[PDB]
Amino acid sequence: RKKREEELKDSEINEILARNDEEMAVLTRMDEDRSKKE
Amino acid sequence: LSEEETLLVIRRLHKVLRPFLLRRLKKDVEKELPDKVEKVVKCKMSALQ
């Protein structure tokens, strides 16, 4: 009822596909090309 | 309105539909369900769109 009435950074997208602390670190190697981008 | 409509008549539905419907869960029989796996997300648009 309160739902009746951002995530552009990597970390909120990391929070979905991780489900654990281990996969949070291995998505940081995709932070040098997607977010950093040389 | 939940008392008159929802509480009374669905209890009459449960009274009638008792030996017809059978529903158990995956966690009732296994507990191997990992999480409440349903989540939600949001996205944006482009101004040209």
UniProtKB/Swiss-Prot annotation, chain B:
<comment type="subunit">
    <text>Component of the SWI/SNF global transcription activator complex. The 1.14 MDa SWI/SNF complex is composed of 11 different subunits: one copy each of SWI1, SNF2/SWI2, SNF5, SNF12/SWP73, ARP7/SWP61, ARP9/SWP59; two copies each of SWI3, SNF6, SNF11, SWP82; and three copies of TAF14/SWP29.</text>
</comment>
<comment type="function">
    <text>Involved in transcriptional activation. Catalytic component of the SWI/SNF complex, an ATP-dependent chromatin-remodeling complex, which is required for the positive and negative regulation of gene expression of a large number of genes. It changes chromatin structure by altering DNA-histone contacts within a nucleosome, leading eventually to a change in nucleosome position, thus facilitating or repressing binding of gene-specific transcription factors.</text>
</comment>
<protein>
    <recommendedName>
        <fullName>Transcription regulatory protein SNF2</fullName>
    </recommendedName>
</protein>
